[PDB]
Amino acid sequence: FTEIKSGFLERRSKFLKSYSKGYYVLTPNFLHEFKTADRKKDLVPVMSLALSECTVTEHSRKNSTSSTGSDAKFVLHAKQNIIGHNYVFKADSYESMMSWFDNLKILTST
Amino acid sequence: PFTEIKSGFLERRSKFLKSYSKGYYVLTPNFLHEFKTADRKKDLVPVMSLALSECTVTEHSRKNSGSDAKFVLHAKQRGHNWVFKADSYESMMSWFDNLKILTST
Amino acid sequence: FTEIKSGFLERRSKFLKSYSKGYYVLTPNFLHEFKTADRKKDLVPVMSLALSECTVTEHSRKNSTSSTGSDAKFVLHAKQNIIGHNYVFKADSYESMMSWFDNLKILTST
Amino acid sequence: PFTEIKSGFLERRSKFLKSYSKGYYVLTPNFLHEFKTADRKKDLVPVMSLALSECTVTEHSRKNSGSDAKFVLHAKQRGHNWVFKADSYESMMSWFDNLKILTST
């Protein structure tokens, strides 16, 4: 819109060992977080992460094991000071995770 | 924001504070972003991101013939009207026209 | 994609007094014509009309009368030399026509 | 094409004719367009419009340390590989990177 990908992801809290869910939109420039999927009424990102200073490092394998989504996670790494502290995201499936990861890898590659 | 369509300094008016503040604006197909500085390598988090899908540009200054370099950006969710001021009528018209074609829907 | 509008339009031949149908995509910059609606395999416009040198002039009223689509036409005018010779387009309905026209009017306005 | 992301002169190689030809390229979110000239007011019909949705940028020159300012644009519908040459490695890398982020899907 122009968007590369959009959908729900859960993001892990380092300290709280829990996840929070948001609706994410990946553009050529940013990973934006929104509270909802209503693109007509929910238009202010709660957060926008600039891809220029991120990298995606690891991701689950289809066979990765242990509770939910053990095969559906990826790590987004910061290269500049949101502090490089890593964000762990969890998608709904391996296939969905790989779609996010494959796009992020090219957008953040060198 | 390297799918940038246009960028440059603009002043934006605050209604309540009765003052202008200059920011560095970047227009993409999705947003008009405000950043504090023009350093696209170190200043990466927008101060503000205005979704183009619910903005329209309505009026602008008539050229002199006081600043004639202003335009209004209107919001729907709702009745909001930001006033911007560019360096010249010419620069204002570039912003206005570029915003217009990204906000026709 | 980024697109403002897309859909089927019929375009009139001045000399032949007949219409030909295409799939059109309106962007902030162009009115593109494609042979089909398959955005995955049909990717070369047969024609791209630059909006910078077009204007939309008249359009049908909901009550415009006489054979098909008498309430669904609009005229796209050229301001520079595709020669200003006018193109007449016909949409599927008044409502659809107005969507095309309203967008074109702002994109080509002064 | 005023939602232009990038524009500039590039040389494109013809495989059959064994020659380069310089054109003025305009990158939008949808296409890489070739125009004969840089006159955006009088030269309005693209010579060629390459749909980004089915292109990828694959390889590029390594910096010198012969031109080191080339990159390959690959097509799917299918196996097509256009070679482009920019004025410098630096200019080539700007094209390459801007194309890359519009062609990740």
Numbering used by the authors:
A (entry chain B), C (entry chain B): 467 to 532, 536 to 550, 553 to 554, 557 to 583
B (entry chain A), D (entry chain A): 466 to 530, 538 to 549, 555 to 582
Q: Any passages from the paper?
A:
In summary, here we present the first three-dimensional structures of the Slm1-PH bound to Ins(4)P and phosphoserine and show that the Slm1-PH exhibits a non-canonical PtdInsPs-binding mechanism. The phosphoserine contacts the β1-β2 region and the β5-β6 loop through the same key residues as Ins(4)P. Specifically, the hydroxyl group of Tyr485 hydrogen bonds with the nitrogen atom of phosphoserine (hydrogen bond length  = 2.9 Å) and the NH2 group of Arg478 interacts with the oxygen atom of phosphoserine (hydrogen bond length  = 2.8 Å). In addition, the ε-amino group of Lys542 from the β5-β6 loop and the ε-amino group of Lys562 from the β7-strand also interact with the phosphate group of the phosphoserine molecule (hydrogen bond lengths  = 2.4 Å and 2.7 Å, respectively). In the non-canonical binding site there are four residues that are consistently involved in ligand binding: Arg478, Tyr485, Lys542 and Lys562. The Ins(4)P and phosphoserine molecules superposed well on to the Ins(1,4,5)P3 of the β-spectrin PH complex positioned in the non-canonical binding site. The non-canonical binding site accommodated anions from the crystallization conditions, and also the phosphoserine molecule. In addition, all structures in complex with ligands show regions of additional density between the bottom of the β1-β2 loop and the N-terminus of Slm1-PH. Intriguingly, we could not assign any ligand to these extra densities.
